[PDB]
Design a protein around this ligand. Structure first.
Ligand SMILES: [Zn+2]
Ligand SMILES: [Zn+2]
Ligand SMILES: [Zn+2]
Lengths: 46, 66, 301, 452, 51
């Protein structure tokens, strides 16, 4: 997220899309991992 | 996991193929009628445009990033 | 630049083509696809003088070569000059087309003799193996020659995907990869997705082509199937809908996600087999590793 | 070579003559095989649809690896007039040539051909017993007249003035012999298919009269390419230009007839050889002592080795010769360059020379890997001797022209010298000696420049 | 090599079949941390691999 703002005030959206697309797959990977952890946490809570 | 055809229709279809094969096997009928040829060409050009856009580009590659 | 061999593995089956005639508005579609094949073969022979052509028809009882003819019939020719194609065309085209249509005549008569037996076994894989053996003979007999395969299969919305064609066709792929011989597939029928032939034409650097209408097929064959092996690397391929290279489970048959195989016979299982025994190789499995896999992952409270 | 020469002759043909050419299926089928493979693929892509295709689509067909090849194919497309470009709605679209497309589709699918591929009369002889050695005998007698050996049989006067009008076979009548040029040894050097093409294209450039037509000779040459050996063909579909063409190609060896004024002619193996191609005989062993041990039994290779090797003996399998000085002097007075001689020796070398060249190059690379050397199939001593014998003829060179001097002013001399240099006729100028030399062809320009 | 009869390590192996992705924008691979145009999305963790 800070990198998603670090370029945002850096070059002004002519460059943030490239960095976002470069870091997309690892972002969906950690998002899926955190979502799986959260849903197993809610499953064991219930 | 995510039509039944009888032998008499089978045999009469084969006999129709036989009489269509014996009499005159006119090859010039393969030429399309200037519309289905255009549709087939349009589909092939769209498919090869998709494949060329995907396969235009495939040590790491150079990037615009500093 | 370099002469080539074109082998057409045409799958002619009266049940499949009858179902295609019933599904389509037109009748006698095998005549149209045979006409398109004949004009395509004449085009390939016109591409280069030293080019060579072979055809294998796969029928419900097996396979049969169509060009070149059975060598005893070549030695006997007896006189069998049927007037199916006119004699005033180019002679090298004329010999090939007449041999092909005479073999079509003989094959349809032979299968009409054997129409009483309905076969549940498709012979496309054996025909592809025979075509690859022909490619080997032509490659090592004459010193080099590029080569190509063409498969004109029909599903007609009736014949689904078949498990028994998984093992042979796959092996054919590797042999094709051994000889740098692309395997090109034209599927005529309502089944838009045919997994095994798509994996074949993707792994052999070929082109897949699913069409729904037999009319205008020569446009398709001379547009996309006319990639001679001398210009394969410089032509981008029109194969749309890239195949996923997955496989099917053994006990459920569904397309497989993250899954399990045995270390003995490599069969894919989407779920743990009951009885702790592999369904194919019949090997006994220890309780420890399957208890580890069946165990849930941890999460804190 | 082979495709480049016929392609160049095809662009030398005007566009309307090309459109008149493209009527029959045989010549279109033959021309289609001369194209590059990407050009052939585009032709077959555009033949079966009756609508024009944009150039952007054909650009999209070609991958990024061989784009220039595509341009080269397009250059061939822009050379044989196979496409019509059209500027419509700001787009450069491509239409196939309608006569060519119709003719090629008639060739492929069949239909009307107007008997452009001949018809069999089902009266034939086996090729090996008659036609093969007929074509062989005609080719060997004309190529033995080419090499200049004495013969008991000489061909007709038409191939004689074919050679007289040719750049090869220079002629003298005060002596009584016919001299081979450098182009003659180049003609002997290349393969028989390119030999047939050079002879036929020069026969094409000869003819301008109304006795025979250019479209008829083109159609008949490509049809003889399209026929098959071993089956005879009949005569009335040919023109009178094409009957006298049958006469001339029977004289040359392309076609067999048993007697003159017959209606049944037999194509030979050379006609099938015309379109495309398909220890060796004539392979020779050369040593450091300039000896020639040639595995040749045909008179052709012996006679063509007699041009530059003093032959000493002949067996049924062996021909014994020596690379003497005077034989190479005879070769250079025949205009044969040493490079063509070295080429003829290396392409006809013994395979033992080739293999020994690979062990010698392996010893060289394991000896001095820092540099790479060519596969010297012949020893360098005989090559050096041949090149010295080449150099010793043209040690002294005489240029014929005129010398101008005796100028009282240096400005006039400099003006005349720079005028001669501007027109490219000067060979020497010297202000200290005040003399400049000009060539024979440029004497008149300097003369009427000085007069005016 | 052929295995012996006494060996009883007849074990299930958990694996996934990745999907070949097609993107016109290069991305960071998870194995070498470099730009690769293609890649195979892993079915378990949605990360991409080179080979
Ligand atoms: Zn197993
Ligand atoms: Zn993973
Ligand atoms: Zn990697």
């Amino acid at each position: 997220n800070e990198l998603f703002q670090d370029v945002l005030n850096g070059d002004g959206e002519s460059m943030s899309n490239t960095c976002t697309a470069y870091l997309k797959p690892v972002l969906n990977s950690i998002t899926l991992a955190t979502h799986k952890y959260d849903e197993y946490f809610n499953e064991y809570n219930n | 996991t995510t039509l039944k055809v009888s032998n008499q229709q089978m045999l009469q279809q084969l006999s129709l193929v036989m009489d269509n094969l014996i009499n005159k096997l006119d090859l010039n009928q393969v030429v399309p009628n200037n519309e289905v040829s255009n549709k087939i060409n349009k589909r092939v050009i769209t498919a090869i445009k998709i494949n060329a856009k995907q396969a235009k580009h495939n040590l790491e590659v150079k990037s615009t990033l500093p | 630049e370099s002469p080539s061999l074109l082998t057409v593995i045409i799958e002619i089956a009266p049940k499949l083509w009858t179902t295609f005639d019933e599904e389509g508005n037109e009748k006698g579609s095998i005549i149209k696809v045979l006409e398109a094949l004949i004009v395509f073969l004449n085009a390939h022979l016109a591409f280069n003088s030293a080019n060579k052509v072979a055809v294998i028809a796969a029928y419900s009882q097996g396979i049969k070569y169509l060009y070149p003819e059975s060598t005893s019939a070549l030695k006997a020719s007896t006189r069998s000059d049927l007037k199916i194609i006119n004699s005033d065309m180019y002679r090298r085209f004329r010999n090939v087309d007449e041999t092909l249509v005479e073999e079509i005549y003989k094959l349809f008569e032979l299968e009409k003799k054997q129409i009483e037996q309905n076969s549940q076994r498709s012979t496309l894989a054996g025909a592809m193996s025979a075509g690859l053996t022909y490619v080997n003979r032509i490659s090592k007999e004459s010193v080099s020659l590029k080569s190509r395969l063409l498969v004109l299969t029909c599903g007609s919305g009736s014949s689904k995907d078949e498990i028994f064609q998984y093992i042979p066709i796959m092996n054919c792929i590797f042999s094709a990869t051994k000889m740098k011989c692309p395997i090109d597939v034209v599927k005529i029928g309502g089944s838009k997705e045919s997994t095994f032939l798509q994996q074949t034409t993707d792994a052999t650097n070929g082109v897949y082509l699913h069409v729904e209408s037999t009319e205008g097929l020569i446009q398709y064959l001379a547009t996309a199937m006319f990639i001679d092996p001398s210009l394969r690397p410089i032509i981008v391929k029109p194969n749309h809908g890239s195949v996923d290279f997955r496989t099917s489970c053994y006990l459920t048959g569904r397309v497989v996600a993250v899954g399990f195989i045995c270390s003995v016979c490599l069969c894919v299982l989407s779920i743990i087999p009951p009885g702790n025994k592999c369904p194919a190789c019949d090997s006994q499995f220890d309780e420890h590793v399957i208890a580890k896999l069946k165990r849930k992952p941890v999460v804190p409270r | 070579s082979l495709k480049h020469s016929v392609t160049q002759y095809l662009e030398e043909i005007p566009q309307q003559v090309q459109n008149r050419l493209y009527t029959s299926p045989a010549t279109c089928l033959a021309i289609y095989r001369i194209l590059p493979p990407l050009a052939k693929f585009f032709i077959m892509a555009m033949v079966f649809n009756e609508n024009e295709v944009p150039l952007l689509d054909l650009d999209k067909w070609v991958n990024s690896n061989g784009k220039l090849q595509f341009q080269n194919a397009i250059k061939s497309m822009k050379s044989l007039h196979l496409l019509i470009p059209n500027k419509s709605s700001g787009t450069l679209m491509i239409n196939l040539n309608p006569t060519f497309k119709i003719s090629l589709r008639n060739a492929l699918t069949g239909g009307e051909v107007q008997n452009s591929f001949g018809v069999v009369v089902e009266e034939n002889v086996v090729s090996l017993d008659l036609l093969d050695e007929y074509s062989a005998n005609k080719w060997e007698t004309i190529l033995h007249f080419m090499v200049g050996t004495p013969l008991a049989k000489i061909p007709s006067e038409k191939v004689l003035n074919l050679l007289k009008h040719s750049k090869l076979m220079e002629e003298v009548n005060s002596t009584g012999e016919f001299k081979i040029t450098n182009e003659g040894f180049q003609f002997l050097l290349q393969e028989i298919n390119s030999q047939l093409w050079t002879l036929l294209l020069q026969y094409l450039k000869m003819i301008e009269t109304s006795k025979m037509d250019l479209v008829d000779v083109l159609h008949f040459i490509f049809m003889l390419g399209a026929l098959e050996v071993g089956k005879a063909y009949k005569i009335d579909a040919l023109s009178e230009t094409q009957r006298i063409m049958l006469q001339d190609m029977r004289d040359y060896g392309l076609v067999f007839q048993k007697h003159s004024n017959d209606s049944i002619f037999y194509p030979t193996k050379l006609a099938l050889m015309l379109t495309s191609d398909t220890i060796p005989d004539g392979s020779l062993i050369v040593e450091t002592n300039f000896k020639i041990y040639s595995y040749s039994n045909s008179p052709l290779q012996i006679a063509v080795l007699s041009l530059f090797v003093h032959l000493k003996a002949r067996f049924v399998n062996m021909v014994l010769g020596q690379i003497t000085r005077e034989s190479i002097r005879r070769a250079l007075t025949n205009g044969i360059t040493a490079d063509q001689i070295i080429a003829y020796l290396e392409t006809h070398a013994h395979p033992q020379m080739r293999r020994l060249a690979e062990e010698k190059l392996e010893k060289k690379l394991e000896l001095d890997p820092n540099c790479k050397e060519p596969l010297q199939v012949l020893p360098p001593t005989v090559v050096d001797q041949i090149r010295l014998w080449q150099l010793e003829l043209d040690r002294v060179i005489t240029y014929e022209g005129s010398l101008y001097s005796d100028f009282e002013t240096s400005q006039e001399y400099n003006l005349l010298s720079k005028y001669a240099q501007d027109i490219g006729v000067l060979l020497w100028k010297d202000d200290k000696k005040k003399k400049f030399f000009i060539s024979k062809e440029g004497n008149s320009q300097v003369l009427d420049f000085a007069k005016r | 090599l052929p295995v012996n009869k006494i060996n009883k390590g007849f074990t299930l192996v958990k694996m996934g079949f990745p999907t070949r992705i097609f993107e016109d924008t290069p991305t960071f691979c998870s194995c070498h941390s470099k730009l690769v145009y293609g890649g195979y999305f892993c079915p378990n963790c949605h990360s991409k691999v080179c080979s």
